[PDB]
Write a protein that binds this ligand. Structure first.
Ligand SMILES: [Cl-]
Ligand SMILES: [Cl-]
Ligand SMILES: [Cl-]
Ligand SMILES: [Cl-]
Ligand SMILES: [Cl-]
Ligand SMILES: [Cl-]
Ligand SMILES: [Zn+2]
Ligand SMILES: [Zn+2]
Ligand SMILES: [Zn+2]
Ligand SMILES: [Zn+2]
Ligand SMILES: [Zn+2]
Ligand SMILES: [Zn+2]
Lengths: 338, 338, 338
């Protein structure tokens, strides 16, 4: 298990909003997995699919490579950018923030300004300043209709265990899945490790990857909500209390019971999240793939999801790596029929 | 046809909310169908698929086994449960009601309390009392994060024909489909009778069952809205006027015309429901399965859908059994191209 | 003391809304009291007055036989009932509930329906379905202008001590008073045990019973509010902490002090409720009867008053039986002058 802070930060900060995972994260995932997998391929949507050959059952584990972000809708006559969200970016988190754009002339920053109080929440109030003085100048700088951008990186390690940064969702789980894969010992299962694309715009990469792989078992590794201020006591998982595994309709009872047994065997703390609906993770589309798949969700709890200050606890990451590795190594043929 | 009140009530009251159909209803459906079907199997999502071997066309008929219900989100320090809905349960129907929970220690009841007027619609106002005095006590009683519950059974036969009970949706149609199956005589069609899972959380079981079966023809048997107080005259079907079959984009014109001819031949009253959108039934996902399926919806009209007092007329149930049996027996190869 | 669950449930479920206590509860109260009382009579309003002859002081103990309920205002052309409340029934507790009506053709049920969300708290939204299709049919079924109904029975024992059911108010105290009466040993006081009528519509039976009895001392046994969710910490009594006895203007200080001494002597836990106003119980009218009466209130705490899920703790019922018996046996001439 054990957290490699340098690799983890590299995986978090690599470029790749939904539909543009090829801008950086994809090559990193391919390179790290090619060293340990029997075969790694990239499909037409950009999913990275790494095969660790085994016997049975066939399992697909998916963590998504894409980040939420923004796209330039148009550039105005004074050289300001008007942007729209890619995935669940909320306008409130954009005020007085830096955005990292992927322009024709490399990575370039812009800022979302604020109007001083004496001149006075929605997308129309959001205008990006890139230091340009005209539309022509912004265009010469490399900005275009369709230019995409991300929250600017800011990795903050607060103490021994806690850290805050944009894009723990889902780079922290992609990191954990990749570490589990690198540490993977012998296993009976036929394992596909998938870096999925476009999770944040409707689970689109995992949909096609599941179709091609045709797994019997599916596990999505995505982040989940942790107890935090103003949550009204409604959130069950807490930072530092371990990986989280949902229960509910998206979650095969036999697979979820198997996961409990494994967690107990390896003495890994395991939290329960009640999910009464099909989840908002790749496991949603994996479960209803083709003839149906036995699915579960394995999550790292974070605070402040979908903002620049997503915050996690490295003890949870470590234990998630350990649990993913143990599930993959312990998995064996069994009857998943509910 | 003919209504078997005892079997019908047993099928209505068997446990099984979305994702937990294995708690009771599934075994009943398997047992009754195994007696008449050539083969019955349960898939990975829990669908019951019973094959009545025939020639052509291949038809799938689906009625869903799952009920809407609730799930325990957390237990508070005073031993009260805080719940969230599974499917379309509305908070208004929970006030001063009993809930039947499926705990580690068998079935146990709780009540949703009301606040006396002198101390004064949303989920936060909903708190379940299970007779416990602390979190530890509620847990010893068997309640957990993730415990599921249902409207408590209350079967009320009002007169010769009308009756009200929780969960006519969709146990009344599952009952009707099962009776039609038991009475099924010779048939040319290759018939799959499916007890589907997770209809109430997005048609998920019928999606995978349709994929595996690959039918040419699909019929969903689900309940529909009947004329009732305060409906502003907008609902077409009425209690006691027979089974209902939609018309609209989800409904293959040739199959629907065939259904009219059959209803006329057997002198079965048949109501028309205008459905301008893809339906909220299993026929939605059956129609867009693989290369496409000729689909129709065959419904029993009920009042007060998704509440504890869903109300139907046994004459409609009888006629639905008769019509389902006749469609299956009359179905023959034909061109379904619109 | 000791709770007889079978008798208690029978007393709770016997028919009898305000003004219609003769439909069942009255005969039960008469029959049980006739076995132990020197004389039992029923007055013109329907009060049951049982005399246990003694010396002094003359005491009247009253628990009310009436339930809150509903009455049919009119039947509409489609056979639905439109109802109005008898006593403090709130429209919110009627949604998707069953009502037990007392018709010309025996007990018959109806349901209060709900309007599905896509077609959208006050009495005009409340319409009762009885399975009829026309006004004439509902009338043939026995429904009339003036037909009365009750919350349908649903007795739920949650565990060893806690239980929830419609109509703990005031059948639980009527049960406790009746058990105390049956266990009553020697006593100096001249005791009248009264099953009062029409408490829920303005304390009307206790008014005339007090006039006829002319007691020197009066105790009302009615339920009171217990700590429960969303009460904002404003309710003092709690389930399981014993009978409750108010303090305040309705409560004679000498009698209330005597009650404390008795509770201490018999080691019965006794809660205090602050009541700054004349109470909403029979003790209100007893106190201002004729030349004035020394009065107190002895209550069983319940949650969710006036709803179908009123919830109590059998330890409190037991201790209330014990305290009532001890007060009656210990009572002796004393000066009640404040
Ligand atoms: Cl996500
Ligand atoms: Cl294959
Ligand atoms: Cl439905
Ligand atoms: Cl085929
Ligand atoms: Cl009262
Ligand atoms: Cl006198
Ligand atoms: Zn996300
Ligand atoms: Zn994510
Ligand atoms: Zn439904
Ligand atoms: Zn349905
Ligand atoms: Zn009352
Ligand atoms: Zn009362």
């Amino acid at each position: 298990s054990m957290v490699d802070w340098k690799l983890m930060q590299e995986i978090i900060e690599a470029p790749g909003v939904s539909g543009y995972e090829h801008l950086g994260i994809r090559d990193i995932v391919v390179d790290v997995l090619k060293e340990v997998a029997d075969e790694v391929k990239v499909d037409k949507l950009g999913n990275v699919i790494a095969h660790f050959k085994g016997s049975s059952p066939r399992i697909m584990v998916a963590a998504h490579m894409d980040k939420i972000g923004v796209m330039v809708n148009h550039i105005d006559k004074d050289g300001y950018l008007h942007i729209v969200p890619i995935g669940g970016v909320l306008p409130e988190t954009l005020v007085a923030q830096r955005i990292r754009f992927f322009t024709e002339k490399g990575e370039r920053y812009g800022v979302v300004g604020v109007l001083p109080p004496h001149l006075r929440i929605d997308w129309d109030q959001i205008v990006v300043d890139v230091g340009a003085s005209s539309k022509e100048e912004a265009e010469e700088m490399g900005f275009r209709v369709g230019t995409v951008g991300e929250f600017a990186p800011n990795f903050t390690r607060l103490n021994e265990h806690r850290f805050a940064t944009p894009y723990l969702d889902d780079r922290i789980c992609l990191y954990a899945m990749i570490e589990a894969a690198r540490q993977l010992g012998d296993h009976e299962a036929d394992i596909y490790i998938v870096g999925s694309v476009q999770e944040e715009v409707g689970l689109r990469g995992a949909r096609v990857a599941s179709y091609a792989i045709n797994p019997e078992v599916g596990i999505a590794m995505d982040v989940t909500f942790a107890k935090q201020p103003h949550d009204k006591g409604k959130i069950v998982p807490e930072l530092g209390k371990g990986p989280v595994m949902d229960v509910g309709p998206n979650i095969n009872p036999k697979l979820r019971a198997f996961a409990d047994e494994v967690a107990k065997k390896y003495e890994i703390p395991l939290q329960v999240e009640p999910s009464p609906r099909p989840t908002g993770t790749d496991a949603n589309v994996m479960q209803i793939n083709k003839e149906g798949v036995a699915t579960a969700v394995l999550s790292i709890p974070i605070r402040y999801m979908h903002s620049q200050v997503e915050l996690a606890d490295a003890r949870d990451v470590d234990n998630t790596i350990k649990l993913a590795k143990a599930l993959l190594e312990e998995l064996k043929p069994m009857d998943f029929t509910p």
